[PDB]
């Protein structure tokens, strides 16, 4: 799939909780973890649409109360090819 | 896909109706029908997440009216490799 | 590990939710699902004591509201060699 | 196209939303993503003055309520040649 789930959090401990939750809830792949700055960490998953909706509702609930919290939880069902250049293909 | 959708019903007729409904309404494979006993019969369907969701919804709506009722509708998007053994591993 | 975890439920749909939750949450092996009769289904998970504690708590929190519900969530950290015989070694 | 459109957001999830919205809304070119620091992310698009105006208006509404939100939505119809040294030629 090509749908995109993105969970931003205030820390890496709420982000790892979210990644685990998301990647256990549905058939999604963890494509990246980005340190934005200011203490903002984004875990981006790529799966089919229903899979990503389920994963991002599992991640949000999980990390809502782990560490400093959850900032964003956003699904983008199709991503322009332009936006794919600014997106991580693997988590290393 | 690997998602599992199950409906618990009181009786075999409501269950059969529900199974047929789910199947007709979505791309799911009916893993099987297992009688809990005590009158609970549960029908298992495996599919991609969204399809499973739709199938479950259809089966539910349909068999609530039929018989005593629909005991349960639950969707598990991903099944741990270990949980496989309890679910019928048999299409039959 | 020898600790036993057990979740009896009223139906197989809450039980399957519990087996999934337990397996995903902690490092526990699913050793069996038993149809007791009367619509009671037990799910037995054998692992290490902390793992089994995590598994049983995750399973109960999961199957508590699915279907008819949770009858019991129990941990037995060491079972006597006599109780072993009754317990199912591998799932059927 | 030479015009610049730039959306600054608090975090990367709103920025990815704004970049998708912008690239989809018009014929702009996603030209770079910048991690400023303090959790500010700037997405920059280059297209005709009509294209960039259409894109930034859409991106401003898209990411206004995604994550922390929009810091700035700005359009520069013509950038001085000096400024083009501090502008990314391609996204990284």
């Amino acid at each position: 799939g090509i749908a995109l789930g993105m969970i931003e959090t205030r820390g890496l401990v709420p982000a790892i909780e979210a990644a685990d939750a998301m990647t256990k809830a549905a058939e999604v792949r963890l494509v990246g973890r980005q340190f934005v700055g200011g203490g903002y960490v984004t875990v981006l998953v790529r799966g089919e649409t229903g899979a990503v909706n389920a994963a991002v509702r599992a991640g949000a609930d999980a990390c809502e109360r782990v560490g400093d919290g959850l900032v964003a939880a956003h699904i983008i069902a199709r991503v322009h090819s332009e936006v794919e250049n600014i997106l991580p293909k693997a988590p290393q | 896909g690997i998602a599992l959708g199950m409906i618990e019903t009181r009786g075999l007729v409501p269950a059969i109706e529900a199974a047929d409904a789910m199947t007709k309404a979505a791309e799911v494979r009916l893993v099987g029908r297992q009688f809990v006993g005590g009158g609970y019969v549960t029908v298992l369907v495996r599919g991609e997440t969204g399809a499973v969701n739709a199938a479950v919804r259809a089966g539910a709506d349909a068999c609530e009216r039929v018989g005593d009722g629909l005991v349960a509708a639950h969707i598990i998007a991903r099944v741990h490799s270990e949980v496989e053994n309890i679910l019928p591993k048999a299409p039959q | 590990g020898i600790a036993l975890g057990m979740i009896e439920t009223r139906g197989l749909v809450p039980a399957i939710e519990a087996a999934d939750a337990m397996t995903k949450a902690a490092e526990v092996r699913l050793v069996g699902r038993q149809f007791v009769g009367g619509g009671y289904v037990t799910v037995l998970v054998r692992g290490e004591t902390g793992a089994v504690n995590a598994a049983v708590r995750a399973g109960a929190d999961a199957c508590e509201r699915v279907g008819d519900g949770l009858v019991a969530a129990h941990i037995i950290a060491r079972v006597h060699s006599e109780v072993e015989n009754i317990l199912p070694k591998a799932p059927q | 196209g030479i015009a610049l459109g730039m959306i600054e957001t608090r975090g990367l999830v709103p920025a990815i939303e704004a970049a998708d919205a912008m690239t989809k809304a018009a014929e702009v070119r996603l030209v770079g993503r910048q991690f400023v620091g303090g959790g500010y992310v700037t997405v920059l698009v280059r297209g005709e003055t009509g294209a960039v105006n259409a894109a930034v208006r859409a991106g401003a509404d898209a990411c206004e309520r995604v994550g922390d939100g929009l810091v700035a939505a700005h359009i520069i119809a013509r950038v001085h040649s000096e400024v083009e040294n501090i502008l990314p030629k391609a996204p990284q």
Binding site: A25, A26, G50, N53, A54, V56, R57, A58, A60, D61, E64, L70, A72, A73, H74, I75 | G5, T49, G50, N53, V56, R57, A60, A72, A73, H74, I75, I76, A77 | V13, E17, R65, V66, G67 | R65, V66, G67
Partner: peptide, 14 residues
């Protein structure tokens, strides 16, 4: 009422 992962979105999701 479907019991399982909920496709329906809770408010937090965007």
């Amino acid at each position: 009422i479907i019991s399982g992962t909920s496709v329906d979105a809770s408010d937090l999701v965007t």
